[PDB]
Amino acid sequence: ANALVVKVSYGGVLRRFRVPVKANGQLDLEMAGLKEKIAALFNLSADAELSLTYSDEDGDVVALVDDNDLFDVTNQRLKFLKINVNAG
């Protein structure tokens, strides 16, 4: 019945917000729902490209591209997700 704490950080200011999950177990948003949510925090122009890369369990710098890999963050069993923004 619990959320995933997501911390993002662009222009060297870390932020943090939470995202709930269903009863079923998947995250209750998608990338188009996510990337326009990040553009709210940072006052970025939404037409700009975002290059979002999270952290794996065993420390790789993975890419995010699709709602297929957002499913994987639940099964990855991470304590809090961290997503870096690279624009322009």
PDB file of C-alpha atoms in Angstrom:
ATOM      1  CA  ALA A   1       0.000   0.000   0.000  1.00  0.00           C
ATOM      2  CA  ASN A   2       3.155   2.132  -0.250  1.00  0.00           C
ATOM      3  CA  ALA A   3       4.993   4.541  -2.529  1.00  0.00           C
ATOM      4  CA  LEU A   4       8.397   4.740  -4.137  1.00  0.00           C
ATOM      5  CA  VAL A   5      10.449   7.736  -3.098  1.00  0.00           C
ATOM      6  CA  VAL A   6      11.994   9.192  -6.195  1.00  0.00           C
ATOM      7  CA  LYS A   7      14.760  11.715  -5.982  1.00  0.00           C
ATOM      8  CA  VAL A   8      15.697  13.687  -9.144  1.00  0.00           C
ATOM      9  CA  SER A   9      18.523  16.235  -9.562  1.00  0.00           C
ATOM     10  CA  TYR A  10      19.207  18.734 -12.353  1.00  0.00           C
ATOM     11  CA  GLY A  11      21.501  21.725 -12.162  1.00  0.00           C
ATOM     12  CA  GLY A  12      22.918  20.297  -8.959  1.00  0.00           C
ATOM     13  CA  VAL A  13      19.749  20.740  -6.945  1.00  0.00           C
ATOM     14  CA  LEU A  14      18.362  17.470  -5.650  1.00  0.00           C
ATOM     15  CA  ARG A  15      14.647  17.281  -5.122  1.00  0.00           C
ATOM     16  CA  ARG A  16      12.264  14.587  -4.032  1.00  0.00           C
ATOM     17  CA  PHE A  17       8.674  13.495  -4.488  1.00  0.00           C
ATOM     18  CA  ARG A  18       6.733  10.291  -4.031  1.00  0.00           C
ATOM     19  CA  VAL A  19       4.762   8.099  -6.433  1.00  0.00           C
ATOM     20  CA  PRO A  20       2.063   5.635  -5.264  1.00  0.00           C
ATOM     21  CA  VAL A  21       1.544   2.047  -6.433  1.00  0.00           C
ATOM     22  CA  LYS A  22      -1.643   0.078  -7.084  1.00  0.00           C
ATOM     23  CA  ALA A  23      -2.888  -2.887  -5.136  1.00  0.00           C
ATOM     24  CA  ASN A  24      -1.700  -5.007  -8.058  1.00  0.00           C
ATOM     25  CA  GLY A  25       1.907  -3.828  -7.694  1.00  0.00           C
ATOM     26  CA  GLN A  26       2.882  -1.664 -10.665  1.00  0.00           C
ATOM     27  CA  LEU A  27       3.755   2.046 -10.540  1.00  0.00           C
ATOM     28  CA  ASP A  28       0.814   4.334 -11.108  1.00  0.00           C
ATOM     29  CA  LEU A  29       2.322   6.545 -13.847  1.00  0.00           C
ATOM     30  CA  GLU A  30       4.045   6.336 -17.209  1.00  0.00           C
ATOM     31  CA  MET A  31       6.842   8.167 -19.022  1.00  0.00           C
ATOM     32  CA  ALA A  32       4.690  10.770 -20.714  1.00  0.00           C
ATOM     33  CA  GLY A  33       3.122  11.206 -17.254  1.00  0.00           C
ATOM     34  CA  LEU A  34       6.600  11.360 -15.775  1.00  0.00           C
ATOM     35  CA  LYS A  35       8.570  13.557 -18.137  1.00  0.00           C
ATOM     36  CA  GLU A  36       5.949  16.307 -17.994  1.00  0.00           C
ATOM     37  CA  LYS A  37       6.036  15.947 -14.197  1.00  0.00           C
ATOM     38  CA  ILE A  38       9.834  16.572 -14.133  1.00  0.00           C
ATOM     39  CA  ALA A  39       9.297  19.643 -16.337  1.00  0.00           C
ATOM     40  CA  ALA A  40       7.033  21.007 -13.598  1.00  0.00           C
ATOM     41  CA  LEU A  41       9.716  20.833 -10.937  1.00  0.00           C
ATOM     42  CA  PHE A  42      12.535  22.452 -12.858  1.00  0.00           C
ATOM     43  CA  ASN A  43      10.697  25.029 -15.024  1.00  0.00           C
ATOM     44  CA  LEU A  44      12.174  23.449 -18.118  1.00  0.00           C
ATOM     45  CA  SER A  45      10.632  23.984 -21.523  1.00  0.00           C
ATOM     46  CA  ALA A  46       8.752  20.752 -22.206  1.00  0.00           C
ATOM     47  CA  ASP A  47       9.825  20.602 -25.857  1.00  0.00           C
ATOM     48  CA  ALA A  48      13.428  20.035 -24.753  1.00  0.00           C
ATOM     49  CA  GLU A  49      14.882  16.532 -24.822  1.00  0.00           C
ATOM     50  CA  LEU A  50      15.384  14.663 -21.570  1.00  0.00           C
ATOM     51  CA  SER A  51      17.988  11.961 -21.080  1.00  0.00           C
ATOM     52  CA  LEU A  52      16.964  10.184 -17.926  1.00  0.00           C
ATOM     53  CA  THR A  53      19.230   7.582 -16.347  1.00  0.00           C
ATOM     54  CA  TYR A  54      18.507   5.797 -13.059  1.00  0.00           C
ATOM     55  CA  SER A  55      20.660   3.582 -10.826  1.00  0.00           C
ATOM     56  CA  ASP A  56      20.581  -0.199 -10.956  1.00  0.00           C
ATOM     57  CA  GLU A  57      20.715  -2.448  -7.895  1.00  0.00           C
ATOM     58  CA  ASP A  58      24.399  -3.319  -8.525  1.00  0.00           C
ATOM     59  CA  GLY A  59      25.467   0.168  -9.522  1.00  0.00           C
ATOM     60  CA  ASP A  60      25.221   0.507 -13.301  1.00  0.00           C
ATOM     61  CA  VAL A  61      24.032   3.724 -14.964  1.00  0.00           C
ATOM     62  CA  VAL A  62      21.005   2.403 -16.850  1.00  0.00           C
ATOM     63  CA  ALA A  63      18.857   4.334 -19.382  1.00  0.00           C
ATOM     64  CA  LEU A  64      15.082   5.007 -19.263  1.00  0.00           C
ATOM     65  CA  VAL A  65      13.262   4.929 -22.581  1.00  0.00           C
ATOM     66  CA  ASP A  66       9.918   3.237 -22.151  1.00  0.00           C
ATOM     67  CA  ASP A  67       7.190   1.977 -19.862  1.00  0.00           C
ATOM     68  CA  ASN A  68       8.733  -1.469 -20.120  1.00  0.00           C
ATOM     69  CA  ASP A  69      11.698  -0.462 -17.947  1.00  0.00           C
ATOM     70  CA  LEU A  70       9.492   1.405 -15.510  1.00  0.00           C
ATOM     71  CA  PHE A  71       7.973  -1.961 -14.734  1.00  0.00           C
ATOM     72  CA  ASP A  72      11.443  -3.219 -13.876  1.00  0.00           C
ATOM     73  CA  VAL A  73      11.985  -0.654 -11.100  1.00  0.00           C
ATOM     74  CA  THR A  74       9.389  -2.369  -8.925  1.00  0.00           C
ATOM     75  CA  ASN A  75      10.939  -5.826  -9.301  1.00  0.00           C
ATOM     76  CA  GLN A  76      14.439  -4.412  -8.952  1.00  0.00           C
ATOM     77  CA  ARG A  77      13.612  -3.803  -5.256  1.00  0.00           C
ATOM     78  CA  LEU A  78      15.492  -0.540  -4.713  1.00  0.00           C
ATOM     79  CA  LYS A  79      15.215   1.530  -1.521  1.00  0.00           C
ATOM     80  CA  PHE A  80      14.761   4.854  -3.314  1.00  0.00           C
ATOM     81  CA  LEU A  81      15.173   5.537  -7.023  1.00  0.00           C
ATOM     82  CA  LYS A  82      17.483   8.309  -8.276  1.00  0.00           C
ATOM     83  CA  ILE A  83      17.027   9.800 -11.756  1.00  0.00           C
ATOM     84  CA  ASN A  84      19.496  12.176 -13.401  1.00  0.00           C
ATOM     85  CA  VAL A  85      18.470  14.718 -16.005  1.00  0.00           C
ATOM     86  CA  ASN A  86      20.587  15.607 -18.995  1.00  0.00           C
ATOM     87  CA  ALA A  87      19.128  18.185 -21.344  1.00  0.00           C
ATOM     88  CA  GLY A  88      20.289  20.134 -24.414  1.00  0.00           C
TER      89      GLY A  88
END
